[PDB]
């Protein structure tokens, strides 16, 4: 309405662009981490089990 490509434009792209790059990445390193993580692992099944037991 009144905005146009103001100082306010950091603040708005500034925190769009804090979840949009926070998404991807925690998709990618979500996933990523599983990924190789589990493959890694050699057991692909306990996912961070800790000191308790292996089953």
């Known amino acids: ?3 146009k490509q103001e ?3 950091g603040i708005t ?3 769009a662009k804090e979840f949009h790059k926070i998404f991807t990445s925690s998709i ?3 996933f ?3 990924a190789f993580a589990h493959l ?3 057991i ?3 996912w961070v089990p800790g000191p308790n037991g292996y089953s």
Do not use: H, I, Y
């Open 13 to 15: 792209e500034g925190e």
């Open 32 to 34: 990523g981490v599983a």
């Open 40 to 42: 890694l692992v050699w």
């Open 7 to 9: 100082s306010l434009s």
């Open 44 to 46: 692909w099944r306990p």
């Open 28 to 30: 990618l390193v979500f």
């Open 1 to 3: 309405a009144e905005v």
